[PDB]
Design a binder for this molecule. Structure first.
Ligand SMILES: Nc1ncnc2c1ncn2[C@@H]1O[C@H](COP(=O)(O)OP(=O)(O)OP(=O)(O)O)[C@@H](O)[C@H]1O
Ligand SMILES: Nc1ncnc2c1ncn2[C@@H]1O[C@H](COP(=O)(O)OP(=O)(O)O)[C@@H](O)[C@H]1O
Ligand SMILES: Nc1ncnc2c1ncn2[C@@H]1O[C@H](COP(=O)(O)OP(=O)(O)O)[C@@H](O)[C@H]1O
Lengths: 241, 120, 817, 757
């Protein structure tokens, strides 16, 4: 791996080395089925979906890691850490939801998959591939569900309007962030910003990571696209100096 | 990645990339709103050079000019890519360039109107 | 202060401060003398430490002053230092006069008595006796040419050549028997000079020169001593060609004499001509051709001390500036080594300063601006610049050039063989030099291979030593059966090619890989046909090795038997320990070097009765400042480094460690950063030089070794200056590893006995699997064919396997419990 | 525009590059002309003729033409206008007198056949191609005529006249712009500008640049002169590049007086910053060629008082010294032949030699008005000028032997006779006669009286050496014009594919065996095949990766990137070159040499496989193809020593040159092919001086015999064996017997040597 230097043979002589490779698909299924069974106890009426849900997450993760190899991009690394983050985020989303149908679970699962395995992509074709394949996996493992509500294209999740982190429509979110941006203009630096849906997605992701403790970002994009502007906006809105 | 592992170990990364055609179209409409390019003499061409995905089926004059602006930005990107392919030296074309293009359009239109419409 | 008597202006502001604040305690001023004097490492005083009785060299030769200098009468540091220097010069002049008179008595004689000759050699210094011989020969040749000035007359120069021949014969007789090392060095230098004089006299005889003013005689370095001259400095004037140099009479000390090959003669002529035209000379050429030491020997021969700088990538200004302007004030020569290696800005600065000083020197043909100071430049200045290929553009018109393309290695070997006392030296030289050419070219290229001229010199010195040892052995044998002892008879009936071959194999075979040994044997057969050798295998040491291996559970083998290669490697390590003080145990990790020296130490302890303890020092893990010693920038306090601390402990003889054998092994990687300080110890001088100036003499029983796995990145100087043994991986086959594992399991208990019986039973059960070509060996051979996330090393797998079998034995123990 | 551009720009060029710029100007004007054809194919061939690959059977071996002439004819015959060249050469009879004519370019016959009459420029270019193909030595003179046909006869006529400082400084130069007077080492241009200032009654300040105080005087002088208007001079400013950069930025922001003139005399070295060269006018000064010119310069440099001293023979000694220095310095231009490398025989060594002469003359003759010529310390001067002066820079043994030959021929008591021949057979029977005068004035009159027809035979070299220099300069001009004029990846793919087709596929290692191991020849050859196979595999893999990148299927890594850069620029990759190669060799020539070497190694491998060590001994091998030839000589010595049970050092090498068919393969004889002997011809193992450039040895037999311990005869000469024509590698030394009436000193002077290739 880049940045890693081969070790001295004199040192390796005294030190045995064991290769702790990525856990196998069966191991991942077992571990995250245990986690999901512990996950879904909060909603008893939804407990029965843990086994297919874990299988779906494992299946999508396997094909994501076979597709976006490290060769294509230096940051195209997939690990069980990503799916553990998936589990933690899903649990954080289901915590406030005392009641929820399977459609909401599918929506949150798709949202977290998009926020984990779809942001690191660079090419629009890769993102479209990810969306098509998440659709296929969701339909494969949850056939008795409606596509329009469970997998509505504007997957926008925010805790800004509602008290909880429940899904939010793009238009109401746009209006709220427009009011907040007017307050930003009147208080902070006055630079006109237009609100296209990409801004909405980016600001939601940035606020999500800032809310999480030890929230650390690596903003990558052409200069002037608004990385610093959006970062300052989110920091001001969340009270961070 | 090689020099610093922490940037890719636990820090999450978000690919802003560049503004899409939709974003550029929205910027063009929002920024070029004060200027009045409402031309009733406009006629819809049989062939319309669409570059914005959600362009309304009847192109208005303002829609046409914003679409042309997005097309100009796309052609700058394409020319930059072509020079990169040919091996010549290249300079990145940022969305800040698009903002400056819109501002210069506003300035030129405002001054030329302020003089020759006074003469009107 | 420093303007008056600029001889101490060599030393820095630090040493100046110490010599100022500590002027009274003269016992602490030896460091400044060691810095500034050539060979004088100490100054001899009485018990009261108030009168300067004499001077002493680093080897031990001492010169007593005719009129001692009293420090009490001259409390000022500079005044009594000047008196000491002047007294040293005048006393050396008096000694030279006495010695030249004595050798003139020895001269013009049909035969000479060895006893009186050895007495004369012991009375004076090596430098003094060499100079006395040179003036004696020069005066004899001048007298013969003056007689020959008539033309067409009978030549007494034949008688001079015959006198040189007979004294050369008595020298060749005097070196076969054992002599003290200092007298041995004196004899070697004197034989070198007499060989050169005989060769040049033969050339003069062949040329039929009949005029003292003929250039064929003027081109040789002639020596003119004037006893009538009132100034002792001007008494000896050195003349060659049209140039003149007054002999400086500085005590250069007993140094390594440099033989004057025709290349060296050309260098002498070129540098002398350049100095007469009042500009320095540049002996450019490839490295290892004697560019620097030609300058050094020219300086030594003129009674001048030369400062040889190291123009490395990491080079200093202030120390260089002060030492170089100190040369400017003193008048001593200064030599630059690998002048091209300097960085471009470094190059420009040094070029500008040397250009200014050179143009000042030509103006003298007087002070110059140096470090914002006026520096009195003595006429006796020479500045010589060796390069490896050009001179900077500002210096091309200021310096003469000279090409050191190739030394005459044949004459080098011949003269050194004849110095060691070898008969038929010409045949041995004409065989050895092409032999090393073949070794350099035909043998497979290796980073650790070094087959240069220094290798020739070391090999020939070792050959002389082993020939003398064989002479002593035959003498002891002759005294134990019979009584008729005659050294000449032993020398005559002793062959000589076999001894040279044995020395070559002793010094080089340990450094060859397994493949190159038959190649070396073929080269020996090609150069030395029909003559062979048998190594004197140390049978008693072999028994000690088998016992130590039995008690340390290691195997023991002989010849082609299992373990034979390792035993032979241990024997070669013992031999190189015998014939060297600096060792280089090189080989891939896992070759067994650690016990390759541990078992040897234990065997020597149990055989010779000399108990041994090793200090295993890691250089890379520790900081170099803490490794060698730290000197505070402000408080100037010196704290001994680890290596310095152990050397001080070993020298102190607190618990009788001088009688004890001790091995300081430097296990770990080596890089040319710390070992550069060690470049003062691996040389025959054998002393460690610290930044504070204090040097510690290397005790004879101390052997320093560096268990380094590879030598890709070490400098060639360190490689050439220490003996080196190669430990290929094939030395240790897996069978020895298995046997050691089984013995370790069987005898020692695992916890620190029932579980000992458990271990014995388990080892007995898995004995069939651990045999040669067993299941484990085949699994390893197949496993090596596979790929692994890390580099695959045999001992890694073997250690993991042994640890896991130990865990199995522990599981058995817990189940039984 | 054309004339002024050439006149101004060429003022800042070396003389060897004026013709290149003139040719570029001619091409530009030819393109400008509308009625004249582009001649694109003609110029394309004229620049890239050597790149065409031929075959042994492609040369029909026309009588009266050399082999190189044969390939030159056949390669240029590819042009449609020159398709009928072979038949016209065969039929023509005047071709013989034209080929060896002194100036063939003046009367080039009409060979090329065309349907319509050619334009004068077309005739000129056709004759230029003809000259390049037939007599490449006359390429420079024909290029001059071609440019004269294009740009007028007197286009270069300005260059021959001495440069007029008055007009170029009075006008057409800005006071801000500094005058850069760049001279090659050994020449100072201060005199010209000082005479300019003196004639133009201008007070000029001259300050040398040697130290910081020099910087101070320079700054004060320029600060005074910017406002006062006087001229200011800085000397040897190449010593301080950073300070020169600071001076340039100082001059950038400065408006001086109209009469301000800043002159920068400097040595031509790359350390000079580019900005000053771009911001200042550059003038190039070179020492005029000719022994006469060098002698005049040397005599002018030495003060008149020093030469005329109490001994009247001192003038004679000084004249001999000046002539010797002129001879050595002029042999430098003929670097491959006159010497082994471009030594720095500057002015300083001449000054040191004069000092030595003065000292030894004063010592020998202590204030005596006259001295006998035999009493002169000739041996002293000879040895000092062989070892100390003129020899310190001499590294090669044979160069030092040559210097000894010159000193013995010149510095002798016999020189002081009126019949002394300062040189021999310079042009037929005529030889240089040394002056009979005893004072400096007669010698000055004699040197000013030289016919100025300084042929290379004046230096002792063969008269064909100047033709070799002209051919080398012609090839140099061809290369420079070629350098003067994405598709690059496509052409790189094309050339990589062709080279992969040309280079052999693999090399087979030798089979190890114990009796073969004992044999030394087998060991040397197995090392050679191992090295060759490893390097061939490396090159083939690199070419495969290059091709793989060319389709785009592979990404250009750093190693691949630098290799591609080297290939595009035409410079040899450092990884490919593991054996010693001539410095000036291009990539294509290296590929051809590598292919031939691999062919030879395949032959030796199959020969060893068919038989064994015994057959391996009896093989005829070209030493040039072998990577390490001296290893081969050493291996033969080892083989004979082992066979005859003799020691290695007691063996000496003997050479028997014979035809391949008429040769005997003795037990101690080894066949050697490919050796070419330059400067002489050997028949029946006897050397004879000849004017031929190189005579190919049919077959060289290396016989090792026991040391006879007998002195070599006076007719025995030692000839160096260089690996290539660069003469940078000394493989070994052969001994030959010269014919009667031949002088071994003449052999030494003419640079006769044996070349592996
Ligand atoms: N004669 C022997 N009999 C049995 N085992 C042996 C013998 N010699 C060496 N070994 C074994 O081989 C190994 C040598 O270890 P050692 O530390 O000396 O290796 P090394 O070559 O010096 O490597 P490094 O560079 O890592 O220090 C040990 O496992 C030791 O038990
Ligand atoms: N959504 C947006 N609409 C309009 N302009 C924007 C938007 N985001 C950023 N900008 C413009 O980007 C500029 C700031 O760029 P900045 O964020 O500093 O670049 P970077 O993202 O490289 O840090 C502002 O002047 C602003 O006008
Ligand atoms: N003329 C000579 N006589 C004896 N030994 C020599 C001679 N020339 C060189 N040597 C040996 O060869 C080595 C030369 O080292 P050095 O002088 O540093 O080479 P260089 O000056 O070319 O760098 C030394 O070890 C020295 O003992």
């Amino acid at each position: 791996d880049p940045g890693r230097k081969p070790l001295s043979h004199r040192f390796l002589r005294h030190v045995p080395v064991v290769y702790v490779d990525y856990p196998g698909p069966a191991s991942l299924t077992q571990i995250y089925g245990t986690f999901n069974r512990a996950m879904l106890r909060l909603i008893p009426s939804l407990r029965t979906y843990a086994e297919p849900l874990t299988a779906a997450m494992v299946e999508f993760y396997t094909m994501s890691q076979e597709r976006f190899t490290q060769d294509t991009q230096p940051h195209y690394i997939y690990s069980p850490r990503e799916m553990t983050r998936w589990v933690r985020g899903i649990f954080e989303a289901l915590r406030p939801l005392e009641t929820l149908p399977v459609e909401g679970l599918i929506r949150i699962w798709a949202h977290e998959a998009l926020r984990l395995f779809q942001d690191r992509l660079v090419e629009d074709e890769e993102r479209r591939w990810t969306d098509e394949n998440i659709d296929t996996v969701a339909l494969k493992h949850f056939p008795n569900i409606d596509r329009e509500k469970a997998m509505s294209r504007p997957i926008l999740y925010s805790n800004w309007l509602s008290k909880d982190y429940i899904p939010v429509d793009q238009e109401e979110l746009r209006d709220y962030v427009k009011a907040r941006l007017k307050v930003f203009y009147e208080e902070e630096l006055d630079v006109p910003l237009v609100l296209f849906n990409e801004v909405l997605d980016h600001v939601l992701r940035i606020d999500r990571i800032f809310r999480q403790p030890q929230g650390h970002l690596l903003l990558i994009g052409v200069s002037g696209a608004g990385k610093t502007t959006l970062s300052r906006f989110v920091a001001w809105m969340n009270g961070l100096s | 990645a090689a020099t610093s592992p922490a940037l890719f170990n636990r820090c999450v990364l978000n690919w802003f990339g560049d503004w899409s055609t939709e974003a550029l179209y929205q910027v063009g409409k929002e920024f070029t709103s004060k200027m009045d390019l409402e031309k009733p003499n406009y006629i819809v061409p049989d062939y319309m050079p669409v570059v914005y995905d959600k362009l309304p089926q009847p192109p208005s004059h303002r829609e046409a000019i914003v679409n042309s602006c997005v097309f100009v930005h796309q052609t700058l990107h394409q020319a930059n890519a072509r020079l990169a392919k040919r091996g010549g030296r290249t300079m990145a074309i940022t969305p800040r360039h698009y903002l400056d293009f819109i501002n210069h359009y506003a300035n030129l239109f405002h001054e030329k109107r302020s003089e020759l419409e006074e003469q009107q | 202060e420093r303007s008056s008597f600029p001889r101490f202006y060599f030393v820095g502001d630090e040493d100046l401060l110490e010599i100022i604040g500590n002027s009274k305690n003269v016992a602490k001023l030896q460091k400044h003398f060691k810095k500034m004097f050539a060979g004088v490492s100490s100054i001899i005083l009485n018990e009261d430490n108030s009168v300067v009785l004499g001077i002493s060299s680093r080897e031990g030769e001492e010169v007593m002053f005719k009129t001692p200098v009293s420090i009490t009468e001259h409390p000022k540091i500079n005044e009594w230092l000047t008196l000491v220097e002047k007294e040293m010069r005048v006393t050396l002049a008096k000694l030279l006069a006495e010695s030249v008179t004595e050798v003139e008595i020895f001269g013009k004689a049909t035969s000479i008595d060895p006893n009186t000759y050895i007495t004369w050699i012991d009375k004076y210094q090596a430098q003094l006796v060499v100079l006395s011989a040179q003036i004696a020969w020069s005066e004899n040749v001048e007298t013969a040419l003056s007689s020959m000035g008539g033309g067409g007359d009978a030549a007494p120069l034949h008688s001079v050549l015959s006198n040189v021949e007979v004294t050369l014969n008595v020298l060749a007789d005097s070196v076969l028997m054992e002599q003290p090392p200092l007298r041995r060095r004196k004899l070697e230098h004197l034989i070198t000079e007499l060989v050169h004089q005989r060769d040049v006299t033969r050339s003069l005889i062949k040329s039929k020169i009949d005029n003292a003013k003929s250039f064929e005689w003027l081109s040789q370095m002639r020596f003119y001593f004037d006893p009538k001259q009132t100034d002792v400095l001007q008494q000896l004037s050195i003349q060659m060609a049209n140039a003149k140099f007054n002999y400086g009479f500085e005590y250069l000390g007993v140094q390594d004499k440099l033989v004057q090959t025709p290349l060296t003669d050309r260098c002498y002529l070129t540098m002398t001509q350049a100095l007469e035209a009042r500009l320095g000379g540049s002996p450019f050429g490839p490295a290892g051709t004697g560019k620097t030491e030609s300058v050094k020997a020219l300086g030594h021969q003129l009674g001048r001390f030369v400062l040889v700088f190291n123009c490395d990538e990491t080079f200093d200004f202030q120390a260089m500036g002060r030492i170089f302007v100190g040369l400017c004030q003193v008048g001593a020569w200064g030599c630059f080594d690998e002048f091209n290696r300097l960085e471009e800005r470094m190059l420009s600065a040094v070029s500008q300063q040397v250009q200014c000083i050179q143009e000042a020197l030509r103006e003298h043909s007087i002070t110059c601006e140096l470090l914002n100071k006026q520096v009195k430049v003595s006429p006796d200045m020479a500045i010589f610049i060796t390069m490896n290929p050009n001179l900077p553009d500002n210096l091309k018109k200021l310096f003469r050039s000279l090409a050191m393309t190739k030394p005459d290695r044949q004459l080098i070997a011949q003269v050194m063989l004849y110095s060691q006392g070898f008969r038929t030296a010409e045949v041995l030289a004409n065989k050895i030099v092409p032999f090393f050419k073949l070794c350099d070219e035909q043998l497979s290229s290796q980073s650790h291979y070094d087959f240069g001229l220094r290798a020739l010199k070391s090999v020939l010195v070792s050959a002389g030593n082993v020939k003398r040892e064989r002479i002593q052995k035959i003498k002891r044998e002759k005294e134990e059966r019979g009584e008729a002892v005659d050294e000449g008879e032993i020398a005559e009936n002793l062959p000589e090619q076999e001894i040279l071959i044995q020395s070559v194999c002793e010094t080089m075979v340990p450094k060859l890989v397994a493949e190159d040994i038959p190649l070396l044997f073929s080269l020996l057969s090609d150069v030395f046909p029909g003559v062979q050798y048998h190594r004197g295998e140390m049978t008693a040491l072999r028994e000690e090795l088998k016992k130590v291996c039995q008690e340390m559970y290691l195997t023991y083998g002989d010849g082609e038997e299992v373990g034979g290669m390792w035993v032979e490697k241990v024997l070669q390590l013992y031999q190189i320990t015998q014939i060297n003080h600096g060792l280089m145990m090189v080989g891939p990790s896992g070759s067994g070097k650690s016990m390759a020296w541990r078992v040897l130490l234990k065997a020597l302890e149990r055989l010779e009765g000399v108990e041994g303890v090793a200090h295993i020092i890691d250089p890379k893990a520790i900081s170099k400042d803490h490794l060698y010693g730290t000197l505070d920038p402000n408080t100037r306090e010196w704290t001994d480094g680890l290596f310095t601390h152990v050397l001080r402990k070993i020298i102190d003889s607190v618990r009788g460690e001088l009688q004890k054998r001790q091995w300081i092994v430097f296990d770990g990687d080596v890089d040319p950063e710390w070992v550069e300080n060690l470049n003062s110890v691996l040389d025959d001088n054998k002393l460690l030089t610290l930044p504070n100036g204090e040097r510690l003499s290397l005790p004879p029983n101390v052997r320093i070794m560096f268990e380094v796995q590879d030598l890709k990145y070490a400098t060639l100087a360190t490689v050439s200056r220490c003996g080196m043994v190669w430990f290929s991986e094939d030395v240790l086959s897996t069978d020895m590893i298995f046997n050691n594992f089984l013995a370790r399991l069987r005898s020692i208990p695992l916890d620190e006995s029932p579980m000992l019986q458990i271990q014995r039973d388990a080892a007995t059960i898995m004995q069939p699997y651990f045999t040669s070509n067993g299941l484990v060996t085949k699994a390893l051979e197949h496993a090596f064919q596979l790929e692994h996330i890390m580099d695959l090393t045999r001992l890694r797998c073997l250690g993991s396997l042994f640890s896991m079998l130990h865990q199995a034995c522990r599981n058995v123990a817990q189940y039984n419990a | 525009l054309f004339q002024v551009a050439f006149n101004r720009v060429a003022r800042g060029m070396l003389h060897q590059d004026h013709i290149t710029f003139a040719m570029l100007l001619a091409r530009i004007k030819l393109k400008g002309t509308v009625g004249e054809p582009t001649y694109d194919a003609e110029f394309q061939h004229f620049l890239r003729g050597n790149e065409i690959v031929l075959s042994a059977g492609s040369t029909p071996r026309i009588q009266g033409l050399t082999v190189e002439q044969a390939e030159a004819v056949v390669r240029l015959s590819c042009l449609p206008a020159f398709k009928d060249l072979i038949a016209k050469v065969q039929a023509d009879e005047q071709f013989g007198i034209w080929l060896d004519s002194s100036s063939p370019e003046q009367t080039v016959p009409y060979l090329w056949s065309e349907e319509t009459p050619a334009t004068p420029i077309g005739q000129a270019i056709h004759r230029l191609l003809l000259i390049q193909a037939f007599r490449p030595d006359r390429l420079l003179a024909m290029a001059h005529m071609f440019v004269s046909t294009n740009l007028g006869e007197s286009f270069m006529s300005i260059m021959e006249q001495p440069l007029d400082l008055t007009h170029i400084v009075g006008t057409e130069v800005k006071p801000n712009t500094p005058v850069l007077m760049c001279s090659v080492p050994g020449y100072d241009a201060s005199g010209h500008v000082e005479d300019l200032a003196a004639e133009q009654n201008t007070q000029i300040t001259s300050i040398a640049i040697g130290s910081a105080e020099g910087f101070n005087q320079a700054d004060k002088a320029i600060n005074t002169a910017v406002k006062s208007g006087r001229w200011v001079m800085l000397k040897n400013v190449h010593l301080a590049p950073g300070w020169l950069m600071q001076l340039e930025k100082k001059l950038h922001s400065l408006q001086p007086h109209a009469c301000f003139r800043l002159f920068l005399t400097m040595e031509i070295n790359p350390k000079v910053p580019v900005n000053l060269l771009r911001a200042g006018r550059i003038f190039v000064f070179e020492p005029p060629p000719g022994v006469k010119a060098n002698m005049l310069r040397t005599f002018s440099s030495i003060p008149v008082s020093r030469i005329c001293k109490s001994p009247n023979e001192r003038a004679r000694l000084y004249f001999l010294l000046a002539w010797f220095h002129a001879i050595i310095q002029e042999r430098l231009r003929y670097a491959p032949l006159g010497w082994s490398k471009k030594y720095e025989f500057g002015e300083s060594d001449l000054r040191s030699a004069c000092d030595t002469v003065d000292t030894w003359l004063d010592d020998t003759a202590k204030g005596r008005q006259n001295i006998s010529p035999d009493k002169i310390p000739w041996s002293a001067l000879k040895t000092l000028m062989a070892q100390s002066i003129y020899g310190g820079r001499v590294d090669n043994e044979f160069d030092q032997r040559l210097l000894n030959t010159f000193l013995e021929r010149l510095f002798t008591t016999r020189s002081f006779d009126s019949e002394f021949k300062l040189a021999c057979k310079v042009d037929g029977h005529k030889d240089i006669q040394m002056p009979d005068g005893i004072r400096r004035e007669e010698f000055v009159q004699w040197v000013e009286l030289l016919p100025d027809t300084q042929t290379p035979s004046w230096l002792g070299l063969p008269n064909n050496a100047e033709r070799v220099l002209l051919t080398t300069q012609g090839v140099d001009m061809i290369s420079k014009m070629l350098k003067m004029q994405p598709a690059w990846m496509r052409t790189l793919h094309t050339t990589a594919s062709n080279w992969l087709h040309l280079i052999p596929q693999t090399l087979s290692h030798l089979k190890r065996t114990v009796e073969n191991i004992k044999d030394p020849l087998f060991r040397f050859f197995e090392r050679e095949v191992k090295m060759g196979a490893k390097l061939l595999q490396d090159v083939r893999q690199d070419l495969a990766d290059v091709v793989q990148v060319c389709e785009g299927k592979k990404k250009q890594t750093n190693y691949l990137r630098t290799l591609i850069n080297e290939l595009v620029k035409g410079i040899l990759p450092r990884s490919w070159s593991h054996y010693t190669v001539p410095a000036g060799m291009t990539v294509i020539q290296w590929v051809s040499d590598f292919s031939e070497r691999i062919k030879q190694l395949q032959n030796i491998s199959l020969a060893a496989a068919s038989g064994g060590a015994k057959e391996l001994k009896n093989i005829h091998v070209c030493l040039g193809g072998l990577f390490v030839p001296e290893a081969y000589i050493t291996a033969t010595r080892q083989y004979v020593a082992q066979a005859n049970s003799w020691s290695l050092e007691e063996l000496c090498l003997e050479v028997n040159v014979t035809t391949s068919q008429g040769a005997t393969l003795d037990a101690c004889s080894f066949g050697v092919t490919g050796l070419k002997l330059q400067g002489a011809t050997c028949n029946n193992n006897k050397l004879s001086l000849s004017n031929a450039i190189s005579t190919a040895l049919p077959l060289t037999q290396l016989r090792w015999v026991k040391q006879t311990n007998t002195e070599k005869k006076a007719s025995v000469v030692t000839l160096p064996v260089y690996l290539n024509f660069t003469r940078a590698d000394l493989i070994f030394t052969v001994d030959f017997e010269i014919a009667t009436k031949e002088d071994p000193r003449s052999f030494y002077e003419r640079g006769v040597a044996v070349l592996c290739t």
